[PDB]
Each structure stands twice: as C-alpha cells, then as structure tokens.
Write a protein that binds this ligand. Structure first.
Ligand SMILES: Nc1ncnc2c1ncn2[C@@H]1O[C@H](COP(=O)(O)OP(=O)(O)O)[C@@H](O)[C@H]1O
Ligand SMILES: Nc1ncnc2c1ncn2[C@@H]1O[C@H](COP(=O)(O)OP(=O)(O)O)[C@@H](O)[C@H]1O
Ligand SMILES: Nc1ncnc2c1ncn2[C@@H]1O[C@H](COP(=O)(O)OP(=O)(O)O)[C@@H](O)[C@H]1O
Ligand SMILES: [Mg+2]
Ligand SMILES: [Mg+2]
Ligand SMILES: [Mg+2]
Lengths: 663, 525, 564
C-alpha cells in the first residue's frame, strides 16, 4: 500500500468516515452542552507550617460543623425524568427552581440499603406545596411546619413555578461530609508560605461560596477561641459537668435495666423526640459561641432563635403526642428518652471536651481571612473545547481503523486486472445501471447498455471459429448478473438484425418469462419431459426482437432433465433457425446444470460480480467447467462501480465514460 | 498469517471464544458478588515526631488492651455450610444474625494443633438457645450464665432468627492481637505533621469502628500516663466497602477470559494439520473432483433428500466423472480413502443413486468384507453376499440384490470372512467384475481404507477408475499423498480425490479466496 | 525520487507554491499589523521572604481596592463594526478617542446570561452626547449628571470627534478583578531578594501605569496597616493603661510608640514607580511574519508533495513505450471553429503534426487500404483536433484526403469546416442519401469531408450496416487517404466497429488526463475486437521541468523560425 491507495480508500469510504466522525462529534457536543456546569470558588487563608493545618481543614470535625450550620444533609435536587432533562432545561433558558428548607426529619426507613430516605415535593403555587414519599400525599404551606406521618418538613421561600417537582433526600451526616470533602481541596501555593488556597467545586455557584465561607469561618473562630480558651471557664465547666451528666446517664442506664428485668407509633415518636432534643442541646452550645464571637442582631444569631423556636414547636407537638399515648408506652418512652437523650448529651460533652483541648494545642496565634470565597462565574467543567476536540479526533481514528479493516478484509474483485493476472479473458466490464424490464429496451442509452454493446462486438470476434452459434452464459454465484447480461446481450444483438433465441435453462429459479411477458405454459421443462413440442415453447419478447424459451414449471429433477437427449435436439434444431442462441444457466458453484448445458454450447462466458465474487471464486468456477469438458472462453465483470481506489491502485477504474450530446 | 487469517479464525471459533469469556466473566461476577464486603474505618490523632508513636500504636501492649476491653478473643461467625452461603445470604436481603457474648470459657482442649476450641450455638428462640461442642447438647438461656461440663458461656441479646447456627471460637490472646494488627494500619499523611491516620478494615462495619475507638482511647489514656495527645476525628466506618473492588474484578475477568480464549484459538490454529480446502490437495498435484459438504439433514441421502446441498455436490461429481471415466479400461469405479469414516460408503452409495436416476444400470459392490454395512443401508437379504461368492458357496446371480428406493443393484459383503484380503485375491472376483461389466453401465466398488488394510489395492487392479475420499478436517494432505502413493506402488492409478465433509468456514474465505462450501439454489417454494 | 525530481516538481508548481506562501504571509502581516498592540508596565518592590507577599498582591482584597479606586468596572471600548476596524484605524493615524466616566449605574438587567449591562454612547460634540441602551435615546452633557430611565451616567472630558460611538459596559466587580489579575504578574527576580517586579499588560499604555501605581500604593498602604496597627495596638493599650514614677516610665513608652507607629515603611519598599514600555510586547511582528512564511512554505510543499504522489496521468511518451506502445508523435498544446493547420500553419503544434505526417507515410505503407482511423481512450483527448489537422497537413502535400466524421454522437466537424448539415454520414447509413451527396469540401482546407449528419438513435448499429464498408471501398478509390474520426473506445464501441475496415488505427492520448493503463486498456479492447492499433499519439504536451529531470527530455519541442 502507498499514499495513492490509502487516499483512494479514504475518498471511497468518505460517507462512512464523515458519518462516524459526525456521530462522534455530535455525541461530544451533546455531552459538552448537556453536562451540568461545575463551578469553583476559592478563598485565601493566612497562617502564622500550614501542613498540619491542611489536615485539620479537611477533618470531619471542621467539615462536620459546616454540614450542621448550613444543613448540608438536606439534599434538594430538581426533578428531571431523563438523564438529559437538566442540561436541556438550562439551554432553554429555564432558571432552576430552588426551595429553602431549614428543618427536615424523614421517618428514617434505614432499611437494608436505602440509608438515605427521600420524598418528592411538587410545587403547587408560591405558598403551598405537596409531598409524596411512597404515595402518601401531604399538603404543606410555607411557614407552618409539618409534623405528620412521622415526617417533619419546614419549607421556606419556594422560588419556582407550579408543577415543578423536587427530590428531597436526607442523607446521613457522614455522607454529607464525604461529599463536601470530595469537592473541597486545600493547597499551599508556595509550599513554604503561610498562605492556604481553599477551593471548592459544585453545580451551584452561590451555594459553594456560602459553604467555603462557612468552612473558613469555623476555622477562624476556632483559633480566635484558642486565644480566649485558656482563661475560659468553659474548660473547668466541662471538667465538672461531664462527670455529673455521666452519673445521671449511668443512673438512667441502671433504671432501664430494672424495667427491662416496639409499638410502631410509640417507637417512631421516640427517635423523633430524641432527634429534637439533640438539636436543641447542640443549639445550646451553638448559641454560646455565636453570641460571643458575633452579635445578636447578626443574621446568624437570628436564625438560631428561629430554629430554636421551630424545634420548640416541634417538641411541643411531640409532647402532646406523648400525652395521648397509653401509659404502658408513656412509661417506656420517658425511660428510653432519659437514656437516648442521656447518651446523646454525654456524647456532645465528650466532643465539646475533645474539641476544646485541640484549640489550646493550636500553635497558631491570629488567623486572618485575606480573601473570602467568591465563585468563578466561568465553569471549570465540562471543558467544552477539549471534549469536542477529543470527539473529532476519536471519531477520526475510529473511522480510519474501520476503513483500514474493511480494506484489508475485502477479497472481492476490484478490477478486471485481478482476473487477467490469472489468465482469465475479461470481455467486458458492465457498470451498475442506476436506472420486469429489459434495460437494453427501456434505456438503450444507458451506460451499462453501452458496455454490453462493447461485449456484443467483442463476442462477434470471439464467437467466430466456434463449433456452433450457441452461447452459454453462466457464473460462480447467484445474483451475479447472468440473467441481466444474457437477456440484455440478446437484446443488443437482436437490434443488429440477427435472429436470436434466448433459452432460460435455469429450471430452478428462472424468471425470464416474467421479464419478457409470458405464456408460462410449455416451457423448457415441459419440452425436456416430453410433454411439449419445440415449436410450442418458443415465444417472442414483446419489446425485444428475439424469441425466448422459458423454463416452464420447476421440475423436481432439473439436472437430470438437462441430460436428456432432447436438449441437444432442441439446440441442434434452434441452431438452424437462429443466428445466435443465448442460454441462461444457474451458477456453477451452486449446481451442475451449467456443466451439463456447456457440453452443447460452442462458447461459454462466466459473469463475475464486481465486489461480491472473488478471483479464486471465478478461478474455481472456470476449472470446474474444464473438469467437465466445458471450455470457458472468458469472463464478464458485472456491476462495476466508480471507485477512486481503483484509479490509484491501478491506472484505470474501468467504469467508462458518458458520451452523448446532452440534447 | 495476516489480518484476514486471524479474523477468520476468530469468527470460526466465536462459540469457543464467547463460551470461555462468558465463563470467566461469570466466575468474576460470582466472586465480586459473593465475596464478603470488607469495610474501612478511620480516625485522626493529633501528636504534639509520630514515628515512635506509630510503633507504640501497633504494639501488643496497646492492641492487647483492646482485645481485653471488647473481648475480641471471642470469635463468633454465622454458620454457613458452603463457601458461598454467606455471600448469597447477603444477596437475598437476609440480615446477618449477631449474638452478644460477654463471658466465654471453653474447656480449653489445647491439643496438638487445635489451640482454638470451638462450639456451635443453635438459636432456638429469642430467649433460649442450644450448645454442642462435640455432640454434648447443652441448653442455655440469655441472662443466666452457664457453668456446665467445664464450659462457661454468657450470651446476651440474641439478635437472630430460630434455627441459625453460630461457630463460637475462643482464639488465644495473641491470635486475637495478630488478627487485629493485620487489619490495623497507621500513617502520618504529611510525613512531618503530628497527624496520625489510624485505619482499620473488617467485615463488620459497626464493630471495626468500636475497635478503632477503643484503640484510640487506650492509646490516649496510656499516653497521658509528647504530652496532650488529641483525638480529632473519632472512628466512623465508610459505608462503601473497600473490598472486593467489583469493577476491577469483572474487568479482569473479561480481559483474562479473552486472552485465554485467544491463546487457545491460537494453539488450535497452529496445531491443526487436517485439510482446509481442496487447494491444499491440488498444491501436491491431486485432482479434487468434488467437495461434498456436510449434510446436516440407514437412509440414502440422494433418495431421502434429493435437493440436499450434499446431493447437489455429488451431482457435480457425477458429471465430472462422466468426463473422467471415459477413456478408461472398463466401467468399474473403485472408491477408497485414507482413513475409516472418511465418507467412502456415503459418497459411493450416493454417487450410485445419482447415476441411477439418469437411467443407467449401476451395480454397487460392497467390497468392505470387514465392516461393510451397505446391506443395512439398502434393505438386505443378508445371505449370499460377496464373501459367499468368493468362497465359492454362492452364484453370481444369487448375490445381486436391488435397492428398494434406489434404482441400482447391489452386492452385499455377506458374512465377514476370516481372510478378507485373501478372498479378494481369488480369480472369482475378476470373474464377477468381468461378468457385471457386461450387464451394467457402471460398477461402483466400496472398499475399506487403504491406510488400514490392503483390500483396496487388490480390488483396484480390476477397476478402471479409482477415486480417494478425503475427510475435510480429519485427514491430512500428507495422509492423502501417502494413500495415493501406496496405491501406485501396488499398480493402482488413483484418478483423483473427493473432499468430503466440508463445512462453511470464514478462515478459508480469507486464507484462500473461496470457502468451497457451495451455494443454495432453489425457488423457496 | 531524487533531487532533480523534487526540484523539477517545485519549479513546475512554482505558481501554486508562490501563491499559497504569499497568502500565508499576507495573513501573517495583516495580523501583525491589525492586532491591537499590548504594552507592558513594570514596578519594583523590595522586601526583606516575598513569597507570601506575592499571593497577597494578587488577592481580591488588594486588587479589588484598585478596581474601586480607578472605577475599573466601567469598561469603555471604542466602537468599530468589524473585527479589524480598530487595527486599521490605528494605521490611518487616527488617535483613539477616550471619554472619562466617573459615575456609571446601569439598570442592571442581570438576566440569564448578560450579567454585564451595556450602553452605546455616540459623541455629538465636545460637550453633549447621546445614549442608547436598547433603542431608548437619551441626551447627556458633560458635567450635569444623568439620572433617567434607571440609568446613572456621568461623563467628563469627552476627548473624541463627533460621530464616534463607544460601548460602555458595567462589568461585575469580580469580572473587573479577574481581568486585572489575568494581566497582572508578580516575580522575585532574585528568588531570595526582597525585590518584587510587578508587571502589568494592557492595550492602553497610560492606563496600565495608573493601575500598577494604584496596586503598588494600595499594597503599600495595606502593608503599613498590618504593622502600624501592631505598634498602634501596643500604643492603644498603653494609652489605655496610663494610671508617678511608673507614669513617667510609661510616658517614655508613650512617645516610643508614637514614633514607631508613624514610620510604617519597613518591610516593603517600592524601588520604582510604574512606567510603560513604549514598545509593545505583543504582537511580536517578526516571529508572526516569519512563522507565516515558514508555515506557508511547508503547506505549499505538502500540497505539491501530494499532487506529485497522487497524479497518475501520462508525463512523457516514455511511459507509453515502457509498455510497448509506439508513440508516433507528441503534439504540444496550441496556445494560439478554425483549423489550426490553416489558421496558424507555423504553430508549434502543426510542426508536430507534420512530424506525424511523415511518420505515418512510413507506417501506413504495407497496410491493407488507405483508410486511417483515429480513436482514443477518453473524450476531449484530441482525436478530432489531431485527425482534422492531420488531414489538413496531408492535403497541402497535394494528396486527395477525405475526412469522415464517424462520431455520430457528438461530432462537430461540420461546424469546424463550414457545413451544409443535411445529408451526412447518418443519412447515408440509414439509406436516405447517396455517397455523392454527403461529401463536402473544406473551404480553407484542401480535403473533402463527410459530416456525421443528424444524430441517429442507433449510432453503433448504423455503423454495422454494410453501407459503411461500401462507402469506404468507394472512397478508397477516389482519395489517396481517408481519415476517420471516431468516438473514444472507453466510452462507446463505435470505433471498434469502424476499425475493422481501417488499415491503420492510431490512438490519441491526452497528456495529463489519460493514464498509461487507460491507453493500454484501450489498445487491448481494440485487439479483442480484431482491430490492430498501430500506435499512439500523445496530445496536449506542456513544457515541464519535472520531465527534464525525471527523463532526459521534456518532449515539448523547439521553435525554429527566423523571427522575421
Ligand atoms: N450491472 C447491473 N446493473 C443493474 N442491475 C443489475 C446489474 N446486474 C444485475 N442487476 C440486477 O441484480 C439482479 C440480479 O440479476 P440476475 O440476472 O437475477 O442474477 P443471476 O441470474 O446471476 O442469479 C437483477 O434484478 C438485475 O436486474
Ligand atoms: N458429507 C457427509 N454428510 C453427512 N454425513 C456424512 C457425510 N459423510 C459421511 N457421513 C456420515 O458419517 C458416517 C461415515 O460414513 P462411512 O461411509 O461409514 O465412512 P467410511 O466407509 O469411509 O469408513 C456415515 O454414517 C455417513 O452417513
Ligand atoms: N494539442 C492541443 N492544443 C490545443 N488545443 C487542443 C489540443 N488538443 C485538443 N485541443 C482542443 O481541446 C478540445 C478537445 O478536442 P476534441 O477534438 O474535441 O477532443 P475529442 O474528439 O478527443 O473528444 C478541442 O477544442 C481542441 O481544439
Ligand atoms: Mg438467472
Ligand atoms: Mg465403508
Ligand atoms: Mg471527436
């Protein structure tokens, strides 16, 4: 192979190459446009080291404090039924709806796998909404909290249009931390400086800047407390408060052992009351550090007063649910509360004590936030240019290897030169006629009929010095063009004023009678079986100029009928009343009928299909004839198509030129 | 070899490749699904160095204190009889039963090898249970401790369903430490910082977090008695198992299955020696008169299914023979071959059937006096075959019989003689052929293979034409060349060969231009 | 291939190479001249470290203070309708107009995408101007501020000519910082020194020096803020702790901190204030034009290298004679409905046809008859050009020549000779004309000709009539030579029918259009039909240096006349 060969192959397969490349580029463009844009916010932290500070920033203690402050365990996602509905909605200019939820307690299924309970909120209007967890429909309103079916939800400021759905997931606290930790990175940017570059990525540009500000601030607050934590009485308080609560907790644990030594409604409210108490208890410590390092009129402090008011209303409704329960359950619940809320308060104090000690160790003095988190409005992902460019390049190398495979795998004939390298005379190369009709009659000026006329004149010189005027036309494989060529060759020889007989000796699948107009009775079969005379089987082609003998009814023994001595009698009789007899036969590599008929034909030509037949397939056919005493004069390449690869591999594409005056 | 050759081989062996690859992927998927998921918990420790603290955390002093606190020497395993019962029980959604044991003293057999005594606890209900160490059944109840047979056991809070068994092992204290130390690792994560990342792996996600908390608190309480060590992150378990990594396991299963399928195909290609196309025989100068495909359809194929693709190939042999059997000494055609079950009886009997329908008088002589079964294939009056004629106890007229659905007469082999090769040397055999050569237009003689016995070389002296039948993949080119030269050495001229049993193969279409199978040509109705 | 081959190919394709290279260099020059020049200003900062000071200089706190001081969120751009209007206006010597805006508040559309609202200010004169945001026209004057339609704008000192438009964008504060941060860089230049080299690039040479001065002074004032607070914080608490010997002792500490508070400059010193390098740093015109030349050359070479390896047509008669095809002449392209042999007898192509006339006189002897058929492989290869001109050069030698236009499909010889179009060869073959009524004389010729007549529906079947051999047998007695023009053989079979009655048959091969295999296929298609092709005539040869190096000869021919 060389440059011309590969370039001709690329020109021939240009439709395949262009289609595959365009499909790959279309997929790349659809991904680059429909993929959710992911933004990046960054902040700058000044450290007075910074290698231990990196691991403390990415710790579940610092990050977990942000999850609690911003309620990052309440995952809200716009509902889009397909995997592309979100991307296309962004392209249509639809602003994504967002709802602000400040309190969410799901019934906490906590089954084998789904540790993340989920509900679906369908916006009805600007004020009220609907909820359906597992089909249970609940109507809710902004403002008034909902405590029904063991589902606590508080939706504030629905900013969306009616009909929009939202998937509201309550993912566990560690899952919220692991998601934040995955998108949150810390760097030094000088490897020696006290400068930390905190970056955070996410699909929401405003949210990730609020998160990175919360991550920075908790850290800033921590080392500011470090200065005031030494003289703080808080340490001595926990040193005294912890053993007291432990004794109370131990007392509660001992009592539970006494009463012990699953009511679906009574158990469900148990976890919810504890969950309200834990948040209320944690809110107590939260109000302490906020009221000191911040102000009361600060919006952060106002939220806690509202959130505490919310939880108090939640417990208030819960307390009434307890009083409405049987005393048999009210007994165990109060006992279970003193232990569960006992263990929780004990755990909080341990973390309070654990976190307090760390602040003291903090070898850091003053902490200053040089730069607060702002979001880069240009998304960092997806990188559209590198995606589309890879789509083009990947589509091209795929198109090339497919073309490279089809070139090395194809074995069919590409030019008459391949047949003539073996010593096979190719008398014509018939192109594909793009135009039950005879082509030589319907379109005499066709490019394929012009190639058959060149075969007519090549045969007039090759059929001389033959035994008789009988020409048998066979081939290797079916649908190679033996009936197309023989029937059209007979039509081009009939217009030259010669008497031609076309015998359809394909007693198996011959359809020449359908192609010429038929009195289907009394064909070649009826003659060979003795139930028809030679005069009753010859019929005239209407728009033709030659007579024809149809195959007749399909016999059960086609190869044995052709061996009858009547067939040679018909040819000897017809060879006296016609100037040329053309016999259409089945393919030789399918059946042996043509090798029987070829004994009585003075000239035999094979028809080779352009790309369907192989050179060895035609050589096997010519040698199967010679083995049966039939001398094949040459071959006729049929179905040639214009190909640039032939023009570069060989000098000629063998298709032929059009020559008419255009009018 | 080139691209077309290897691609044709891959197309031909696609069943083998697909089956081996699917078996490997099935094993990989079954492992990825049935292997016990192993979780990982981690904690963060602040050190005020940390290189000596790593070796102190992994010491038997710190770890041994955790074994004593959590009773990690009491090993409890859910009982599953197979090596996959645990994995499939997890797939069926069955929550694994767990029992809390706070006191366990086994009789401590402490024999030559089994330093880990074991019992089997079978849950009977939520409250009581059973115990069987070596068949000794003991009933126990949650709460009340058991001190019987030198076996102390205290089971609290059986959380399982009745019928579940549990293997309760009391492994030695060092074995409990060595197991913990094997799954417990310490890192620095900055190589300079005072931050220690304690990780612990295990099949129980809740248990390993309790163990790593105990290791942290024990190392904490020990360090105070580097000053104030601090526990930044208490141990929590990552809910996503770290092992088995299902994607890399299945991907390796696919890739390993493919490279195994390829080397097996690569071996079978380089190892096979049989004939692949008639071109191989004709490179040696052997005329192949036909290539008969395998007929996927005691019957004669030329009679049962005359439109068969194999009968169409035999008709092509009938016309090739009409041109090759002319200019022969007589009208006797002997059909032999190299190896048995190559198709000599299939071809000769069906060739006789396709020549009989053309109106010719054909005689099929079953001269396989050893394993000839043509009488069974044609319907037989088994008495008075060729053996009885050659041994003189039958006349030539009494041995010829007519094939019922045929059109040709046949002579069966008769009773198997003790001297088949010596019977064929009798002058009666040439008398039968000289007599039959006047009453029939063609005599087809079926013979044994030449590389097995010499009967065909004796018969081939009186046959004007001799053809060998080569089986497609079973016979080799040298095997057929050895056969033709063994005939010529005995004065028998083999006219050519008949390749039998050809199957459609893509490798032949790429190696050679033609697969030599043949086309189907009928009007579908 | 060798040196001579490639050099001949470069000489032949010199027009293509020169044109492609000149186009690439023209594009490179137009880019180097029309691209906006980008200047660079630098300042030097000295510090005792300087690695944390680099990240503090590039921070949104320091840079954001400069955006607020200089109003860098008010983007003003001269309005030029094309992507090159700015560059060419600079080349024409037009000084860019600039307007000073100190207050700008747009209605802040803040829609889905356009977070940067924009208006268009059209200068009317030195004093007043116009504004159009979305078609709403508002007239404004320098001085008096405008508060209308929710649009606040204060334009001072319009320095431009009337008619100039300006796009006034109010980009967000972060976008103004991100643009500044992208062009602002900090370096150390010693990696150990307390010297910081602040550089800033931009299209405005004066503006970027004002920005880099603001960045330096803001970082300077900021630096004092870090420490002058420290010495003030000590002084603050010391002033808060003043309660007599200790009072005098603290009075000494009172002034010691009053003096250390003021001298803020210490750690950071600005060695040099920002000045702009008047020579733009971009675009680098020399490297752009040089790359334009080199890229244009390697593109011209690979295109020439492709056309050389892809071409298959005939290049010399040697290619035909390697196959065993006798080439009797090589006719050059005549750069000059006329007969060339008559209009310009001294043409170089007619001199080559005369060489064919003498080569034929020796090749047409020992032939069956005096009929010469001229065919070819492809249409428009020169079969009618050569046969009609060959007939004209043989007619001047005193011979009776008959030119038969046997191209019954697209024959135009009657148009080329002057025609009584009735009664051509078609009318004769179809029987509706006598042989005497179809022969006509070429006016400025010297030979008779038979036109094709009306285009028949069956041209190949008419030529098979026995009348055609009767015409040739009759004409072969009244003429010394019969030249038959035929259609191409690879198109139709007419020439293979006619070639049976011709004693000599020659193929015409077009120089670069036909391939050697195309001519070999044609000669073998004739032989298959019983027509013996004597040889070939290469037509349309052009002078090529590649032929002179690949082969020894270009086969074009020399001009030989006395110039007067
Ligand atoms: N060169 C060709 N151009 C256009 N159509 C063709 C050509 N050759 C064959 N065909 C068409 O393809 C089909 C196959 O031809 P057919 O004579 O039935 O094949 P065969 O007898 O060899 O089995 C026909 O319908 C025919 O019209
Ligand atoms: N081309 C074939 N197609 C289908 N079946 C075949 C073919 N050749 C042989 N067989 C079957 O395989 C078996 C072997 O044939 P057989 O005549 O007994 O072999 P041989 O005489 O050479 O030892 C037979 O049962 C036969 O029916
Ligand atoms: N060597 C040549 N020099 C100049 N013009 C030529 C030459 N050969 C052909 N032509 C012109 O190109 C056109 C093609 O010639 P034509 O005889 O019509 O081709 P053909 O008969 O082979 O199809 C004509 O107009 C002719 O004048
Ligand atoms: Mg057909
Ligand atoms: Mg047998
Ligand atoms: Mg012409």
């Amino acid at each position: 192979i060389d440059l011309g060969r590969v370039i001709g192959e690329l020109i021939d397969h240009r439709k395949l190459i262009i289609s595959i490349t365009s499909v790959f580029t279309l997929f790349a463009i659809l991904y680059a446009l429909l993929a959710t844009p992911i933004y990046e916010t960054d902040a700058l932290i000044q450290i007075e080291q910074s290698a231990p500070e990196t691991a403390l920033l990415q710790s579940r203690m610092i990050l977990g404090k942000t999850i609690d402050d911003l309620n990052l365990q309440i995952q809200i996602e716009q509902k889009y039924f397909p995997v592309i509905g979100r991307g296309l909605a962004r392209l249509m200019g639809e602003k994504p709806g967002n709802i602000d939820i400040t309190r969410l307690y799901l019934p906490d299924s906590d089954d084998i796998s789904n540790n993340t309970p989920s509900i679906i909120l369908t916006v009805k209007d600007k004020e009220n909404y609907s909820i359906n967890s597992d089909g249970i429909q609940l109507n809710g309103v902004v403002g008034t909290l909902l405590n029904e079916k063991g589902i606590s939800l508080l939706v504030n400021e629905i900013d969306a249009k009616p009909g929009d759905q939202f998937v509201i997931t309550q993912l566990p606290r560690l899952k919220a931390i692991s998601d934040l930790l995955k998108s949150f990175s810390v760097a030094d940017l000088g490897k020696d400086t006290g400068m930390l570059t905190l970056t955070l990525t996410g699909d929401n540009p405003k949210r990730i800047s609020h998160i990175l500000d919360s991550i920075s601030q908790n850290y800033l607050a921590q080392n500011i407390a470090r200065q005031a934590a030494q003289d703080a009485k808080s340490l001595e308080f926990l040193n005294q408060q912890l053993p007291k609560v432990r004794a109370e907790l131990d007392s509660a644990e001992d009592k539970l052992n006494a009463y012990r030594k699953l009511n679906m409604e009574a158990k469900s409210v148990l976890d919810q009351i504890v969950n309200v108490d834990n948040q209320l208890n944690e809110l107590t410590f939260r109000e302490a550090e906020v009221s000191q390092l911040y102000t009361k009129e600060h919006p952060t402090y106002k939220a806690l007063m509202e959130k505490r008011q919310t939880l108090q209303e939640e417990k208030s409704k819960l307390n009434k649910r307890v009083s409405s329960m049987p005393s048999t359950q009210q007994e165990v619940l109060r006992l279970s509360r003193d232990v569960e809320s006992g263990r929780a308060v004990y755990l909080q104090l341990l973390n309070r004590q654990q976190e307090l000690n760390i602040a003291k160790s903090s070898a850091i003095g003053n902490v200053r936030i040089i730069d607060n988190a702002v979001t880069d409005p240009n998304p960092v992902r997806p990188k559209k240019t590198i995606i589309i460019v890879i789509g083009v390049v990947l589509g091209l190398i795929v198109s090339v290897v497919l073309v490279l495979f089809q070139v090395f795998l194809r074995r069919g004939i590409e030019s008459p030169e391949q047949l003539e390298e073996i010593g096979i005379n190719v008398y014509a190369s018939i192109p594909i006629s793009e135009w039950d009709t005879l082509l030589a009659v319907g379109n005499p000026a066709d490019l394929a009929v012009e190639a058959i006329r060149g075969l007519r004149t090549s045969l007039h010189f090759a059929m001389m010095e033959a035994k008789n005027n009988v020409l048998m036309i066979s081939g290797a494989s079916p649908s190679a063009g033996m009936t197309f060529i023989s029937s059209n060759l007979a039509a081009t020889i009939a217009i030259t004023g010669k008497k031609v007989l076309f015998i359809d000796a394909d007693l198996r699948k011959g359809y020449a009678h359908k192609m010429f107009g038929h009195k289907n009775d009394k064909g070649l079969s009826e003659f060979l079986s003795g139930q028809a005379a030679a005069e009753m089987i010859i019929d005239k082609v209407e728009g033709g100029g030659f007579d024809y003998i149809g195959r007749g009814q399909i016999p059960p023994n086609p190869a044995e009928l052709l061996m009858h001595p009547r067939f040679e009698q018909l040819l000897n009789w017809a060879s006296q009343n016609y100037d040329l007899i053309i016999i259409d036969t089945p393919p030789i590599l399918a059946v042996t009928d043509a090798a029987i008929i070829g004994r009585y034909a003075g000239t035999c030509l094979l028809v080779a299909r352009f790309e369907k037949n192989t050179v060895k397939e035609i050589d096997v056919s010519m040698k199967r004839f010679e083995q049966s005493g039939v001398v094949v004069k040459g071959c006729i390449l049929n179905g040639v198509v214009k190909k640039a690869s032939s023009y570069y591999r060989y000098g000629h594409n063998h298709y032929g030129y059009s020559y008419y005056d255009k009018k």
